[PDB]
DNA sequence: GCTTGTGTGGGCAGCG
DNA sequence: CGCTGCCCACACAAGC
């Protein structure tokens, strides 16, 4: 969301000082959308996929419509969400 | 090239 | 009081 991504505590709230854009889940690529679930391994699972996510969580390749045709790389999903657990 | 579709961008209510 | 769940309008890219 705007407040923060579905990651594990990514309070990366829109900060122009930080190089990130704000995208929505790959709604239209549900199967692939679903692995995002897996990377959102947070107990208190953040919003669904209508909320938005920021760029730092995926590979630049898979960023968005700039991928292959008009959406992500269907074989890529946010993997940069978080290392293990914040302190 | 312009219009339409999908992505982009952000919000409100109830309980620790 | 903030967070989670779901929706609309505009610009860019494709079609006519």
UniProtKB/Swiss-Prot annotation:
Assembly mode:
Homodimer. Interacts with PAWR. Component of a THAP1/THAP3-HCFC1-OGT complex that contains, either THAP1 or THAP3, HCFC1 and OGT. Interacts with OGT. Interacts (via the HBM) with HCFC1 (via the Kelch-repeat domain); the interaction recruits HCFC1 to the RRM1 promoter.
ZnF endpoints (THAP-type): 1-81
State how changing residue 8 to A affects the protein, per the record. Answer: Does not affect DNA-binding
Q: What is the effect of changing residue 48 to A?
A: Strongly affects DNA-binding
Phenotype upon changing residue 45 to A: Strongly affects DNA-binding
Tell me what effect the entry lists for residue 52 to A: Does not affect DNA-binding
What outcome follows a substitution of residue 36 to A?
Abolishes DNA- and zinc-binding
Pathological association: Dystonia 6, torsion: A primary torsion dystonia. Dystonia is defined by the presence of sustained involuntary muscle contractions, often leading to abnormal postures. Dystonia type 6 is characterized by onset in early adulthood, cranial or cervical involvement in about half of the cases, and frequent progression to involve multiple body regions.
Family, according to the entry, reads as follows: Belongs to the THAP1 family.
Q: What does this protein do?
A: DNA-binding transcription regulator that regulates endothelial cell proliferation and G1/S cell-cycle progression. Specifically binds the 5'-[AT]NTNN[GT]GGCA[AGT]-3' core DNA sequence and acts by modulating expression of pRB-E2F cell-cycle target genes, including RRM1. Component of a THAP1/THAP3-HCFC1-OGT complex that is required for the regulation of the transcriptional activity of RRM1. May also have pro-apoptotic activity by potentiating both serum-withdrawal and TNF-induced apoptosis.
Please give the tissue specificity annotation from the record for this chain: Highly expressed in heart, skeletal muscle, kidney and liver. Weaker expression in brain and placenta.
What this protein is called in its record is: THAP domain-containing protein 1
Q: What is the effect of changing residue 46 to A?
A: Does not affect DNA-binding
Q: What is the effect of changing residue 78 to A?
A: Abolishes DNA- and zinc-binding
Known consequence of changing residue 54 to A?
Answer: Abolishes DNA- and zinc-binding
Query: What mutagenesis or variant effect is reported for residue 32 to H?
Result: In DYT6; lower activity than wild-type
- Phenotype for residue 24 to A: Strongly affects DNA-binding
What stretch of the parent protein is included here?
Answer: 1 to 82 of 213
Q: What is the effect of changing residue 26 to A?
A: Abolishes DNA- and zinc-binding
What results from changing residue 11 to A?
Answer: Partially affects DNA-binding
Give the species this sequence originates from: Homo sapiens (Human)
> What does the UniProt entry list as the effect of changing residue 31 to A?
Does not affect DNA-binding
Changing residue 5 to A: reported impact? Answer: Abolishes DNA- and zinc-binding
List locations, semicolon-separated. Answer: Nucleus, Nucleoplasm; Nucleus, PML body
């Amino acid at each position: 969301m705007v407040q923060s991504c579905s990651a594990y505590g990514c309070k990366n709230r829109y900060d122009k000082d930080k190089p990130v854009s704000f995208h929505k889940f790959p709604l239209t690529r549900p199967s692939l959308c679903k692995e995002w679930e897996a990377a959102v391994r947070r107990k208190n699972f953040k919003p669904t996929k209508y909320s938005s996510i920021c760029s730092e969580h995926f590979t630049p390749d898979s960023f968005k419509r700039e991928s292959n045709n008009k959406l992500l790389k269907e074989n890529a999903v946010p993997t940069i969400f978080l290392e293990l657990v914040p302190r």
